[PDB]
Amino acid sequence: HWGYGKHNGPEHWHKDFPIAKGERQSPVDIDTHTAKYDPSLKPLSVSYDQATSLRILNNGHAFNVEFDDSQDKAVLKGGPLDGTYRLIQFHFHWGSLDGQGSEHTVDKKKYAAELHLVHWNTKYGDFGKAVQQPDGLAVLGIFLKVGSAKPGLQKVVDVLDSIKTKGKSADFTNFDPRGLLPESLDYWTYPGSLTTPPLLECVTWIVLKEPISVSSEQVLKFRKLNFNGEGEPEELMVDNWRPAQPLKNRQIKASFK
Ligand SMILES: [Zn+2]
Fold first, then answer.
1. Binding site for Zn(2+), residues?
2. Which sequence positions are flagged as catalytic?
3. In the beta sheet, which residues pair with residue 139?
4. Residue 105 contacts by C-beta under 8 Å, 6 or more apart in sequence?
């Protein structure tokens, strides 16, 4: 009832999910000329040394690399955040062409893909409770451009053949998400939403300025995934991004000058 096709894509989502037209929807365009440096942001803290990946799942819209979130093992703190946010999963959005695929844009520039590392605020006890709160989630967004390969992505790429179709999962232990980060942690932040239904307005977005580079061959393997289930007509999983939404009564703050 929702997807990225010709008849169920983002422009239709409001019928089942009326917050699609809400006040704090994501993604947005980041205008680097109007985002203002905020010297109050605290330092941002990514603590992934104890991360425990478990599984990778094709959910029919993207693939999720899932983590054990039953202890503070991989946590995000600092920056704009109060308290501790635990990593639950990461996933990507990507294009059919290298000139599109990201959800956020920077001065209207679209990147080839965008990585979302999803974390929930431990004060709410579990993810399902957290998404009901305005400060329930913190999503670290990282742009991907096509150039050199990202060595830390290759283990993800190589398992995709085993999860080609919707509903397939595979064991995916011992994956280190630190290998997906750029050098700099400079970021923009603003209050927003999930970018897929139910589109809940529960996210503090933290979008890194520095993209990571992936190779053409790595992105091509993302584009071999399928939206459909096994034994259904093949529909390539491409262009699984929501376009920028109105900023409305929000300000984007920068961590850097
Ligand atoms: Zn996402």
1. 91, 93, 116
2. 61
3. 118, 205
4. 27, 29, 30, 111, 244
Q: At what resolution in Å was this solved?
A: 1.0
Single out the residue of 172, 177, 173, 174 nearest to residue 152, CA to CA: 177
Domain ranges of the chain: 1-257
Query: Which residues participate in the annotated binding site for substrate?
Result: 195-196
* Three-state SS at 160: helix
CA of 155 to the centre of ligand 1 (A): 20
- β-pair partners for 192: 203
The rounded distance, in Å, linking the Cα atoms of 205 and 81 is 10
Method: X-ray
Superfamily of domain 1-257: Alpha carbonic anhydrase (3.10.200.10)
First CA to last CA across the chain, in angstroms?
Answer: 43
Contacts 24+ apart (CB under 8 A), 81-86: 81/138, 81/204, 81/206, 82/135, 83/121, 83/122, 83/123, 84/121, 84/122, 85/119, 85/120, 85/121, 85/122, 85/137, 85/138, 86/119, 86/120, 86/122
**CA 231–ligand 1 middle distance (angstroms):** 27
Distance CA 62, CA 112 (A): 15
CA of 115 relative to ligand 1 center, distance in Å: 7
How long, in residues, is the chain?
257
Question: Rounded to 5 degrees, what are φ and ψ at 188?
Answer: -110, 150
> Which helix (H) or strand (E) element contains residue 208?
strand 203-208
Tell me the two tokens of residue 134. Answer: 């305005």
